[PDB]
Design a protein around this ligand. Sequence first.
Ligand SMILES: N[C@@H](CC(=O)O)C(=O)O
Ligand SMILES: N[C@@H](CC(=O)O)C(=O)O
Ligand SMILES: N[C@@H](CC(=O)O)C(=O)O
Lengths: 306, 306, 321
Amino acid sequence: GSMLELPPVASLKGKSITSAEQFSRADIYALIHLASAMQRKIDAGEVLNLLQGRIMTPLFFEDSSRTFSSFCAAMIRLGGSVVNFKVEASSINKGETLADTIRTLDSYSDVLVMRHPRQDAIEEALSVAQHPILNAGNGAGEHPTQALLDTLTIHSELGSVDGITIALIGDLKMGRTVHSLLKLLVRNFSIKCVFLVAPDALQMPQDVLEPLQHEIATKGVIIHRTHALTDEVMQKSDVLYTTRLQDITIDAARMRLAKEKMIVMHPLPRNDELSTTVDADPRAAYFRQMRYGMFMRMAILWSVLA
Amino acid sequence: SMLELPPVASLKGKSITSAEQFSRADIYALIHLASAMQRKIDAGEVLNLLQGRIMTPLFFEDSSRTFSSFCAAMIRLGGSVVNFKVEASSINKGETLADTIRTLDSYSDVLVMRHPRQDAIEEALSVAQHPILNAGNGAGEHPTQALLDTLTIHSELGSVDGITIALIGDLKMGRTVHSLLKLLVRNFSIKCVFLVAPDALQMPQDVLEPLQHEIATKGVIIHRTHALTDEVMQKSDVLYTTRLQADITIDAARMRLAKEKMIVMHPLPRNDELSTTVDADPRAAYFRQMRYGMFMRMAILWSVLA
Amino acid sequence: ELPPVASLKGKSITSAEQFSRADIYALIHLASAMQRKIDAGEVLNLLQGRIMTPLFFEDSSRTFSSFCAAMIRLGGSVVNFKVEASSINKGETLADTIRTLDSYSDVLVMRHPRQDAIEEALSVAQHPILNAGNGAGEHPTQALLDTLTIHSELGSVDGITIALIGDLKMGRTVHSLLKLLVRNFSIKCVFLVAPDALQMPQDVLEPLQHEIATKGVIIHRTHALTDEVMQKSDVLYTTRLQKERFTSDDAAALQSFAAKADITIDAARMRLAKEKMIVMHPLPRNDELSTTVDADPRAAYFRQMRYGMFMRMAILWSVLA
Ligand SMILES: N[C@@H](CC(=O)O)C(=O)O
Ligand SMILES: N[C@@H](CC(=O)O)C(=O)O
Ligand SMILES: N[C@@H](CC(=O)O)C(=O)O
């Protein structure tokens, strides 16, 4: 993988990342090819020193296993460093405001990775930070880097993103991952069809679907709402993208209905909506998805900080 | 390297426990080293001075600035951090402080220690082979805060001799003001100090009494006030305020009385004693102060470890 | 100058049993070489771009810090994963957690209160896992650094008389150490010094019974540091009461440590010890090992931690080379 270039995606330079809306099709493909090259070099055991002396600081005001770790791992595999700030062992116990906390980490860091239970917290953070903030999840709003890594996953596993039928399953109302993913897919690709699979109370919100209306109509994207993984959903979907609470269960029995050429995805963590009986299936892409996450995050950090 | 970033020789291999241990020449050499670190980092240069050396933080109480600042400064020097947490440690199995110290001392080149007991630093020093840097010992001292505070004054105003400074808030329990008063009065010709606090929270007699010889021979003027009077507002070149862990609040209305060229400083975190209405004022130096902190800690770490 | 121990390459470390004598000596010599270079101030860049992720489900000072420090001094990096701040709060299983960190890491360092958690991790992990403690089971890298300590301090492991003292029932350190010494060395004598309720378990001794017999290793049980134990032992290896592993059963076991044994090591007790010997303790200690011993040249339990770092460098390099 030695002779591969790592050209940073120029449109990302020095910018905060808050929404799937900010990326073009050209941006997404450029990040995919960058991530794929990162992967090749890392897997061949090559050592990258692109971000030596640059600091990422995680600011996680709620729990994370993969997003936090993969961001740290991505930064370190670029040669960068991480300052391990913790909210519970911080001056927030002494009454410190969110804005003062941002200005603090912003004094030391080159990039901030922020996850917060309030949707409006990223906005507040942007209004005071000088360095880029990467949105690692803002309440029930968005998770833009999850959308990007999810798209890398589809592209690598199936070989194409245009033309797919995808089911978004579970808690679509509160799921920030399905919010960013729908936006990123519909805005930039020629999606055939989207099944919105959720109980009525947990359906995809209007504030996501409405801004997409022009794109949905002009590209002819077929939207279908169901409250179950029906035979039709199982038989037509190239991607079953399921999510946690926050019948739609996927187990081996259910998988007998799926196409040979398809993938099951889940941003994780999972509960019983996605059974361990699916794990040995070649079509279970939800573990590989995490490793794709680290490479996408390397492509993003290098592009942001180059 | 020895030209651009000469280490301050007097600090080599030494523990830092008190503002008292520094001379005027030490402070100026640190200040000049910190500005050179600043210039190199802000120009994007990568420093490799402490590769292979380990700092370990030992924080028995919370910190946002001091912990992060020290970690960043170590990293920006090319050194590394072992992220020890007291709450996830063998202290829960009955391990003493002395044994904890010997433990981290077996792996580390420098320890950074914050503890709610004033004498805990002295116990740690009796067993440690490697330097310990006091990041706060009860209501005792915070010597690196006084150093970065003095760098902040020097950089913003252009000199430290001749200033009128107000120390405002909980002066009794404020380890920052204890160290700062000591550092300033011992080593500079301070014109006037205002100690702005009710008698119940006034500067301790055990800080004032040992400064007797320097107050006398440099003719430093010192007055107590209970409130932030108009005289204090009009005469002060530096308003240094702190968390009362009446009538001491600095807001945009109070600022209308301040000199045109002065700074407002605060070691942080703040409560209502320092209104956010002041944050847009160019005189508000308490965010820049944190960044000076990182460069001062780089100058300290490099001098101690070179 | 720092050749990795080839037999360890790419392999998980779960038990003292997986090591041969040649493996132990090659690790010791590699560890001593790491120590010479680190002490001379040399900077190593052997694992640049490799990541270790600590997965600690219980408390640690030495083991966690030592592994991180060892990784760093090899030029490697750490992803500081925190169990209490993870998706485990949202219901994520152990296996899914393992798969997660395994997606980003080159090596996992795992400590868990359940003895069988390490095996479950192994069945799903692609990258090597290092057992940093599995319940009251084993602490294999402790056993290695302890043998490094005995070797460096006394100059020989074969022929020693060793007392294993304290909570032998819940002591994963003495479990691993007893297995490592007996399988790979000609130990002259082992004193098992504990109250009956905390004695070395049968599931440790029985698999060792063949080696004990055919090597002629003397095993004695006592509940006290008698004159005989003090006068004959080349090493006194003492341990903490493992309270966190402990009903009236529990209460009986817990108080037996002071009530049904006489096993404190203090300066007065040390007046009976040989001139050429060491006192060891994996740490942390409570009152079983008095601070009056710390000034004694024979107190090796602080130097033991530093040997720990060098053994862990030799191990990490050997696993990841
Ligand atoms: N972990 C993802 C989805 C989930 O929580 O299941 C998120 O934080 O958005
Ligand atoms: N945080 C600083 C100052 C303050 O608490 O106001 C200290 O810990 O000393
Ligand atoms: N720290 C060692 C010994 C002890 O805990 O007492 C262990 O974890 O096994």
